[PDB]
Enzyme design. Structure first.
Site, short mmCIF file in Angstrom:
data_model
loop_
_atom_site.label_atom_id
_atom_site.label_comp_id
_atom_site.label_asym_id
_atom_site.label_seq_id
_atom_site.Cartn_x
_atom_site.Cartn_y
_atom_site.Cartn_z
N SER A 199 8.59 46.30 7.00
CA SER A 199 8.36 47.46 6.18
C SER A 199 7.86 48.64 6.99
O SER A 199 7.27 48.46 8.09
CB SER A 199 7.38 47.12 5.14
OG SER A 199 7.90 45.95 4.54
N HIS A 249 1.66 51.48 2.36
CA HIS A 249 0.93 50.23 1.97
C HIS A 249 0.48 49.53 3.20
O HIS A 249 -0.53 48.80 3.15
CB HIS A 249 1.78 49.28 1.10
CG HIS A 249 2.09 49.77 -0.29
ND1 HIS A 249 1.14 50.11 -1.25
CD2 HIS A 249 3.29 49.88 -0.92
CE1 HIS A 249 1.76 50.44 -2.38
NE2 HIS A 249 3.07 50.35 -2.18
N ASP A 279 5.87 56.00 -0.82
CA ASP A 279 5.23 55.05 0.09
C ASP A 279 5.49 55.43 1.56
O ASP A 279 6.17 54.71 2.30
CB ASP A 279 5.82 53.64 -0.21
CG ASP A 279 5.14 52.58 0.54
OD1 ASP A 279 4.01 52.71 1.05
OD2 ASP A 279 5.79 51.50 0.71
O1 QJS Z 1 5.71 44.37 6.26
C1 QJS Z 1 5.23 44.54 5.18
O2 QJS Z 1 6.00 44.68 4.13
C2 QJS Z 1 3.82 44.66 4.92
N1 QJS Z 1 3.31 45.24 3.83
C3 QJS Z 1 1.93 45.20 3.88
C4 QJS Z 1 1.03 45.69 2.93
C5 QJS Z 1 -0.32 45.52 3.21
C6 QJS Z 1 -0.75 44.93 4.42
F1 QJS Z 1 -2.09 44.80 4.66
C7 QJS Z 1 0.15 44.47 5.39
C8 QJS Z 1 1.51 44.60 5.07
C9 QJS Z 1 2.81 44.31 5.76
N2 QJS Z 1 2.94 43.71 7.01
C10 QJS Z 1 2.45 42.51 7.36
O3 QJS Z 1 1.85 41.86 6.42
C11 QJS Z 1 2.60 41.92 8.69
C12 QJS Z 1 1.43 40.93 9.04
C13 QJS Z 1 2.87 40.50 8.89
C14 QJS Z 1 3.87 40.22 10.06
C15 QJS Z 1 5.01 39.57 9.64
C16 QJS Z 1 5.99 39.22 10.59
C17 QJS Z 1 5.82 39.66 11.93
C18 QJS Z 1 4.65 40.31 12.31
C19 QJS Z 1 3.68 40.59 11.35
#
Ligand code: QJS
Length: 230
Positions: free
Chosen positions: A183, A41, A89
């Site tokens: 993730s 994802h 995933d």
């Molecule tokens: O970590 C996730 O679960 C996840 N799942 C997604 C699915 C689609 C998608 F376009 C992105 C993601 C994404 N990551 C994020 O949004 C990262 C941007 C956020 C972030 C959080 C804390 C520290 C640094 C950066």
């Protein structure tokens, strides 16, 4: 990571930061000299954004001798992954060249025996995801030890309500948990990679919504086939 602590710098030499247009997006894990495993994802809507993988890192922003940002030759989502499902995933990233190995960059052995981790086994998850409800992003790698939660508990109506297939496993999420930005990263049990954090939206730190991790042993043949693609 909610409820965790700062990781020991470079003590997890398999840890990767998957980056999109120079920003951390998801965790990943170095599984072979030229290949990083993460979640699908993370990149499903990335279009033609530039994907890179940062290896040998502790700080996202500061220089360190072992830190190297690699370009990606190929991103290979699992062919059965779909937006809006939690299944299959997984994503493999082929680096532009084999990673330079050393004490701070090393692939992690990964599980092929397709049998459950014992309930309660303490496994480590690390990442650069949010560390509080306001969304604060840490500069440096955080981690937490989480006990495996048996699948039947995880599948109760009060928890994930039947969604945990044989290909998935759970870990407790009571105030210690993986959160947004973690993730794709590794769940490591007994020094071997057991799971990859799923990358669907999930509430963070609610004990009634356990962490969900894709079991890498369930996908061994797929991982091997993509690598042989080189
Ligand atoms: O970590 C996730 O679960 C996840 N799942 C997604 C699915 C689609 C998608 F376009 C992105 C993601 C994404 N990551 C994020 O949004 C990262 C941007 C956020 C972030 C959080 C804390 C520290 C640094 C950066």
């Amino acid at each position: 990571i909610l409820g965790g602590r700062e990781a020991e710098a470079h003590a997890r030499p398999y840890m990767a930061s998957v980056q999109l247009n120079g920003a951390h997006l998801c965790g990943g894990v170095l599984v072979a000299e030229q290949w990083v495993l993460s979640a699908a994802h993370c990149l499903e809507d990335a279009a033609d954004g530039k994907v890179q993988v940062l290896l040998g890192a502790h700080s996202l922003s500061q220089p360190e001798p072992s830190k190297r940002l690699y370009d990606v030759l190929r991103a290979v989502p699992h062919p059965d992954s779909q937006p809006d499902t939690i299944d299959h995933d997984l994503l493999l990233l082929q680096l532009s060249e084999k990673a330079t190995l050393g004490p701070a960059v090393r692939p992690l052995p990964w599980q092929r025996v397709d049998r459950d981790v014992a309930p309660g086994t303490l496994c480590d998850v690390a990442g650069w995801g949010i560390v509080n409800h306001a969304g604060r992003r840490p500069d440096s790698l955080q981690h937490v030890l989480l006990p495996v939660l048996d699948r039947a508990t995880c599948n109760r109506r009060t928890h994930h309500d039947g969604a945990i297939t044989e290909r998935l496993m759970c870990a407790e999420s009571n105030r210690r948990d993986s959160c947004k930005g973690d993730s794709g990263g590794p769940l490591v049990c007994g020094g071997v990679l057991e799971g990859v954090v799923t990358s669907g939206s999930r509430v963070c730190g609610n004990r009634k919504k356990p962490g969900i991790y894709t079991r890498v042993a369930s996908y061994a043949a797929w991982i091997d086939s993509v690598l042989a693609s080189a």
